[PDB]
RNA sequence: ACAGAG
DNA sequence: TCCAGCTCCACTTAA
DNA sequence: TTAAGTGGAGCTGGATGCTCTGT
């Protein structure tokens, strides 16, 4: 990430000191050392999942006693959370019903 | 089954460790700074890859700044940290601007020159089977990926099937897409034509264009070669060369 | 992995073993389906499998033309081979005297040991392979029609029906991967079987230039 | 360099695509005025 | 570099990539509690956003001029110094300034009480200048330092300068070009 | 007239964001290395940040 | 050099 | 307005 | 340490439908 002097708002680059690492100007004396963890996180996007996950997949979220799909009232369905985009969106829940002579797909 | 053509559909497509890390970090500490990427097993699983933390190290030091295999550690199962360098040819040491932005476009799983790729079915009532449409430009490497027939894989672009397979094979590669091209819009021509062209392209070992260039190794007549295109320097050519012309 | 790399030494092996068999080498039939759970019995996976000097080939005699004319098969181990490589299988070639081998390179190869290659002897022939190439038997491809290399004798018919030079026929280059399966040179003429579209076929005449 | 990047703009991707213009900057040993005309008509076509 | 790398059906547990990941960087040299190493708290690097500055730590809805003038008088009696823009001419004349209907501005007005501002319901601002009323709006915010200093030319090459305080918020105030105009149309 | 108000301010040395080997450097680039006669700064270092 | 026509 | 040749310059191997 | 063979990048030079009918 960018950051600049409260001297003269050039910018700041990461060098190594006698004790420490410090952000130094190049033209000024200020320095800053580096006295405990500082992060920056990016979060790019993630892949589509639509294709994915359709035709058979090995999904593993069921468990005792889930509950039954609402059309059908039976627990022949699979149903999951993930995350759609990168991994600071709340996950979502989707699932899908698969019954004899009964094709459905629900959010 | 769609389950076998998906994991051969993902060992061919570009796939990016910008597209599978859940997040990219730098990290400064008072002793050291780098730059940290947890995989995102979760998407690896679901996306049947063959990737894991060794196998971005292996593609981490493929063209990169000459970084180090040493610069590079595989701690847990998804974390990989990339310790920097001075790379020291016009760069300073904050080069992790560089590579915070360059990192997640390097190659993990896939072939580099492929843009993307779709699974294609058919709709007879007969069976349901499934073909691969790859928009790339490298025919070898799809030939040579596991789960792919190579014995049965073709392509549009007569260059890389002259390069791959041969020259007769291009040579029916350009009777095929001729006759494809002249199909699609209505128009019917008998394949004697076609194959009479794509006979005369290909009767020098090499395939050769109907441009100026192809035409001055087909034909040596300076008059036949200078009455269409550049006309003054094979004038000059033919006279400083002494070159002697038949008029046949 | 270490089933896609073992799947991977199977299938170059088969290749070379087809590409031997068309070339007029003795393979035997017991080497064509070599079946990869019957290719686990010489060598193992991975870490006790050895490539580079345990999947060789000096078996390859030409049984028509003389038991002593025998061709190398090599699977240099690292990805770029450099000169001191090649100056190795040139003295071990040296020192069994055989003439021709192959190598079957892992990525490729340095810029000078493919000069060398050229100017080693003009009784020394090597012949550069990646195994990108020999993953598929290009021969087997629906694209590429049957070849078969003809003799003298034939060639000789050949000028002798249509009245031709040997410069008048249409060409097929030396770099050409079909040209490389049969390891033809600058001289020899093809015979290609093109199929037709109906039950017969077509039979074109290529010269090596 | 902040009075530049204020005008170009804020937002984080704004200044991740602008970054690699100040280590350019940066590696010329422009940081004044002066300095940057003095590069500036060592490019000048001379009329 | 060994290529041909191995992998395992196995599923990663979610905890041990979480202190792995942990382990990795919570690491600290911190235990240096000396003069050098120490850092000032009050000259921190700026980042970029100039409202945003903390990126490091010891660890917004765009407001409207009646809640301002509300903030002011109710939550503190505190004395605020205000910026406001003016339009070019005030519906004044120039008291026998040697003039040709000139523009008005408050060179030429004295001191007084000048006009009345009327704060409506629902949002409205006014400011009554005599006959006209005009409209009073927010300007774009200001986030950095502005000083209200003075300056003083007491004698001929000496005097004193002194600053008065700062300022925060600005107004922009603009004629209501409706209600002057609907008053007679052209 | 032409208003045009030109400061300066003092920043403090003993405080650690002053790295005294860069501004050892930087007012021995500025400032003649023992002339003194005229020159921006007092002492060996940059003391000042003119506005 | 421009406008037409097929 | 679009596209093959020609020439300059870094980039590894090898001695 | 450096000689050398080969990649990649910028510059350069070529080309762009057939006729009549008039001012
Ligand atoms: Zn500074
Ligand atoms: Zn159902």
């Not at chain 2, 790339?136 to 490497?141: P, S």
């Not at chain 3, 990805?79 to 190598?103: D, F, H, S």
């Not at chain 5, 990663?12 to 190493?37: C, H, I, R, Y």
Request: hydrophobic share 35%.
């Amino acid at each position: 990430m960018l950051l600049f002097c409260p001297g003269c708002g050039n910018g700041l680059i990461v060098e190594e000191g006698q004790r420490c690492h410090r952000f130094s100007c190049n033209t000024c004396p200020y320095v800053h050392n580096i006295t405990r963890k500082v992060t920056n996180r990016k979060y790019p996007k993630l892949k589509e999942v639509d294709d994915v996950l359709g035709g058979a997949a090995a999904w593993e979220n069921v468990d005792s006693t889930a509950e039954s799909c609402p059309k059908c009232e039976h627990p022949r369905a699979y149903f999951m959370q993930l995350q759609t985009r990168s991994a600071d969106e709340p996950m979502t829940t989707f699932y899908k019903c698969c019954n004899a002579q009964c094709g459905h797909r629900w959010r | 089954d769609a389950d076998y053509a998906r994991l051969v559909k993902g060992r061919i497509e570009k796939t990016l460790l910008g597209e599978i890390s859940e997040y990219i970090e730098e990290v400064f500490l008072p002793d050291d700074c780098f730059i940290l990427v947890k995989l995102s097993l979760e998407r690896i699983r679901l996306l049947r890859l063959e990737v894991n933390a060794e196998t971005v190290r292996y593609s981490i030091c493929t063209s990169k700044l000459r970084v180090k295999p040493g610069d590079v550690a595989v701690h847990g199962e998804a974390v990989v940290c990339v310790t920097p360098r001075e790379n020291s040819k016009s760069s300073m040491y904050y080069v992790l601007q560089f590579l915070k932005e360059d990192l997640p476009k390097v190659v993990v799983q896939g072939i580099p020159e492929v843009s993307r790729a779709v699974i294609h079915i058919d709709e007879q009532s007969g069976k349901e089977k499934y073909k691969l449409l790859v928009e790339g430009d490298n025919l070898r490497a799809v030939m040579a990926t596991h789960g792919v027939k190579g014995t049965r894989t073709t392509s549009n672009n007569t260059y890389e099937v002259e390069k791959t397979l041969g020259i007769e094979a291009a040579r029916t590669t350009i009777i095929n897409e001729i006759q494809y091209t002249m199909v699609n819009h209505g128009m019917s021509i008998d394949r004697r034509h076609v194959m009479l062209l794509s006979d005369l392209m290909t009767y020098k070992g090499e395939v050769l264009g109907i441009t100026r260039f192809g035409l001055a190794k087909m034909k040596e007549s300076v008059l036949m070669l200078a009455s269409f295109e550049k006309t003054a320097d094979h004038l000059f050519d033919a006279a400083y060369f002494g070159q002697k012309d038949s008029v046949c | 992995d270490d089933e896609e790399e073992t799947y991977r030494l199977w299938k170059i092996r088969k290749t070379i073993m087809q590409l031997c068999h068309d070339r007029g080498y003795l393979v035997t039939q017991d080497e064509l389906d070599q079946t990869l759970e019957e290719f686990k019995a010489q060598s193992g996976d991975k870490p006790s499998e050895g490539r580079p000097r345990r999947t060789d080939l000096t078996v390859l005699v030409a049984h028509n033309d003389d038991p002593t004319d025998q061709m190398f098969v090599f699977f240099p181990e690292e990805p770029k081979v450099g000169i001191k490589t090649i100056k190795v299988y040139c003295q071990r070639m040296q020192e069994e005297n055989i003439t021709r081998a192959l190598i079957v390179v892992q990525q490729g190869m340095t810029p000078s040991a493919k000069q060398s290659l050229v100017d080693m002897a003009p009784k020394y022939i090597l012949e550069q392979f990646l195994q990108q190439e020999l993953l598929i038997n290009i021969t087997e491809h629906e694209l590429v029609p049957e070849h078969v290399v003809m003799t003298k004798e034939e060639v000789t018919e050949l000028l002798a029906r249509y009245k031709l030079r040997e410069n008048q026929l249409p060409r097929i280059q030396a770099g050409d991967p079909v040209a490389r399966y049969f390891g033809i040179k600058r001289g020899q003429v093809v015979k290609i079987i093109r199929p037709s579209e109906t039950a017969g076929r077509y039979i074109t005449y290529r010269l090596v230039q | 360099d902040q009075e530049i990047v204020q005008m170009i703009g804020t937002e984080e991707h704004v200044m991740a695509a602008f970054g690699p213009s100040l280590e350019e900057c940066q590696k010329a040993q422009i940081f004044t005025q002066m300095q940057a005309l003095k590069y500036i008509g060592n490019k000048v076509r001379r009329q | 570099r060994p290529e041909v790398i191995q992998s395992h059906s196995i599923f990663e547990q979610g905890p041990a990539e979480m202190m792995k990941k942990k382990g990795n960087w919570d690491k600290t040299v911190d235990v240096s509690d000396m003069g050098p190493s120490h850092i000032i708290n009050i000259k921190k690097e700026k980042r970029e956003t100039d409202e945003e500055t903390k990126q490091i730590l010891r660890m917004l809805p765009k407001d409207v001029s009646v809640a301002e003038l509300l903030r002011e008088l109710s939550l503190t009696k505190e004395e605020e110094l205000l910026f406001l823009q003016l339009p070019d001419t005030l519906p004044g004349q120039p008291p026998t300034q040697d003039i040709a209907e000139n523009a008005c501005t408050l060179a030429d007005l004295t001191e007084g009480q000048v006009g009345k501002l009327l704060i409506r319901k629902s949002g409205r601002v006014q400011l009554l200048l005599g006959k006209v009323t005009l409209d009073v709006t927010m300007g774009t915010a200001c986030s950095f330092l502005q000083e209200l200093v003075s300056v003083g030319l007491g004698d001929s090459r000496t005097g004193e300068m002194t600053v008065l305080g700062h300022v925060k918020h600005k107004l922009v105030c603009s004629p209501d070009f409706e209600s002057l105009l609907d008053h007679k149309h052209r | 007239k032409q208003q045009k108000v030109e400061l300066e301010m003092a920043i403090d040395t003993l405080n650690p964001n002053y790295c005294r080997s860069k501004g050892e450097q930087i007012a021995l680039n500025v400032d003649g290395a023992c002339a003194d006669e005229t020159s921006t700064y007092s002492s060996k270092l940059m003391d000042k940040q003119t506005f």
